[PDB]
């Protein structure tokens, strides 16, 4: 029996409100979440991150379009359920307001964890660590190229933790970093329903082996880190989710991102003196196509996309709403193994994707900025290598005293890390049992996480400037 009252949870983690509430109080609770998210430094920082080209779109403007698409889809779904009188059997009678807000805020903060330079910045963090720990050598009986003495395999109970830590640190992902950013570092203290909408994939980052055949789509990318194995269990207990399941509303945010994928890039190219509309018209025609793109042709650039977007929306949104309504029990159970978008509506998106891949993502200027970002991130990871070579006692003394006469270079590198990251590290370490043989392993894991958080919390310009400054060039 579908009941959305057991899924829309308005409790919090700290100082949660208790008792029985009314519609006005629930709406007030969910508006404060918007107030917190919109006035946060993480959202503000998005206006200095590059989407494709360094009046071009940043990550903030693209999110502001995904938000509109998701809101429109949610309103269409809600309207289609009133024409069938199902808003009282499904429990959405008094929860229509929060339904749009959750989707919109999930659409807005769907890109707050991505590192500088994007996809080429994510590989650089992963490769550099793979040469330090070599996870592939911990998949069988003890043999070893690991550079850390406290993580080499030698003692099965410690071996399992060793291999888990070695595998986790080499799987960095933006979606997994978003949860850590909103929970541990920033400490926004949002409701459970709002956090559940930004958990797109459900594969643990320490997972080794083959995925079950019933979840081969929800397991294709890492979902969360090893430092949140306790926070996700409580999330599953609060939102009534089984192991390896997804929140329902997450399916909408995933669709809105797919519609607004390659339509904006084309406009950016057409306003960056690359090609002309006529050329674009010709590329699309030779691409295949319905009555969706032709009708928008008949300034000019400012009013061609301005109608092509409307044409594609009016034919794609209702299909998504119908797919959501038809497959409702499986989505509500959290075990649906597909996406909302083998039909004629899926070919139009592939058309734009192919045109963008062939004529936009191969320009010489885009490719150079992908080789420069790789170099910059790899270089920055090597300057802070000395911090990863110290001993446990040395690092403890350094973090405690903060003025050490034995380490003149490392004491100055440590002071450049942001304050909130250091408090996160201190709080994480202060919860472990000191009289335990597993203390050094956890300490090293948290130190590596601290370094990764510092590297991934930058902008593309600040990292570039710091890289030039720390190498005595500028």
């Amino acid at each position: 029996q579908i009941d959305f009252r057991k899924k829309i949870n308005w409790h919090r983690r700290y100082r949660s409100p208790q008792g029985v509430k009314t519609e006005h109080e629930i709406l007030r609770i969910f508006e404060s979440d918007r107030g917190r998210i919109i006035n946060s430094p993480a959202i503000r920082r998005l206006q200095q991150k590059t989407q494709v080209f360094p009046a071009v779109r940043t990550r903030l403007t693209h999110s502001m379009e995904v938000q509109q698409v998701g809101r429109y889809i949610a309103k269409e779904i809600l309207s289609r359920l009133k024409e069938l009188k199902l808003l009282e059997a499904y429990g959405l009678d008094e929860l229509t307001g929060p339904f749009e807000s959750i989707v919109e805020m999930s659409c807005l903060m769907h890109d707050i964890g991505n590192p500088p330079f994007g996809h080429f910045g994510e590989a650089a963090i992963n490769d550099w660590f793979r040469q330090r720990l070599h996870p592939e050598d911990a998949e069988s009986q003890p043999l070893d190229r690991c550079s850390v003495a406290a993580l080499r395999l030698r003692e099965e109970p410690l071996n399992e933790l060793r291999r888990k830590i070695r595998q986790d640190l080499c799987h960095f992902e933006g979606n997994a970093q978003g949860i850590r950013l909103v929970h541990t570092l920033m400490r926004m203290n949002l409701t459970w329903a709002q956090v559940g909408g930004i958990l797109k994939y459900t594969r643990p980052a320490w997972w080794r082996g083959e995925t079950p055949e019933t979840h081969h789509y929800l397991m294709k990318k890492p979902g969360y880190y090893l430092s949140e194995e306790a926070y996700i269990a409580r999330l599953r207990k609060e939102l009534n989710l089984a192991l390896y399941s997804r929140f329902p509303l997450t399916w909408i945010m995933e669709a809105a991102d797919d519609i607004s994928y390659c339509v904006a890039d084309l406009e950016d190219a057409v306003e960056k003196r690359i090609f002309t509309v006529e050329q674009l018209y010709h590329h699309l025609h030779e691409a295949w196509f319905s009555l969706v793109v032709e009708n928008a042709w008949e300034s000019t650039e400012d009013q061609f996309f301005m109608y092509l977007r409307v044409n594609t929306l009016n034919k794609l949104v209702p299909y998504a709403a119908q797919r959501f309504i038809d497959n409702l029990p499986a989505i509500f159970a959290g075990t649906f193994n597909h996406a909302l978008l083998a039909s004629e509506c899926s070919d139009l998106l592939k058309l734009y994707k192919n045109v963008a891949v062939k004529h936009v993502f191969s320009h010489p200027d885009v490719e150079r900025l992908e080789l420069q970002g790789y170099r910059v991130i790899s270089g920055l990871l090597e300057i802070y290598r000395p911090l990863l070579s110290l001993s446990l006692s040395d690092f403890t003394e350094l973090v405690e005293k903060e003025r050490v006469k034995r380490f003149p270079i490392e004491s100055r590198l440590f002071h450049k890390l942001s304050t909130r990251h250091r408090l996160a590290y201190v709080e994480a370490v202060s919860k472990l049992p000191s009289d335990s043989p597993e203390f050094p392993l956890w300490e090293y894991y948290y130190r590596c996480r601290l370094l990764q958080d510092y590297i991934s919390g930058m902008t593309d310009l600040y990292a570039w400037d710091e890289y030039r400054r720390l190498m005595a060039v500028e």
Partner: protein
């Protein structure tokens, strides 16, 4: 919409692991006519040029396709280390 780095790393690691046992892997990729999905064919051969096994995988998502390729390669590796 792109391919995640971890899946590619796992694929390369599997190929190197089973190549360091005196084998070889050949790869080819293409697009299907009407099935609307990408197609990957793998062939495992020996040093002497003899073909030992072949397999083909169809899927419209890159990550799932590469995961299937990697786990098939691992299955072939451990079933060739079962004997010989």
């Amino acid at each position: 919409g792109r391919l995640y780095s971890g899946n590619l790393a796992a694929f390369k690691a599997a190929t190197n692991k089973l190549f360091q046992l005196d084998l070889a892997v050949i790869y080819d990729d293409w697009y299907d006519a009407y099935t609307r999905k990408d197609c990957i064919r793998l062939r495992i051969e020996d040093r002497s040029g003899n073909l030992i096994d072949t397999s083909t995988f169809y899927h419209h998502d890159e990550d799932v396709l590469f995961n299937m390729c990697t786990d098939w390669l691992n299955h072939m590796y451990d079933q060739l280390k079962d004997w010989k």
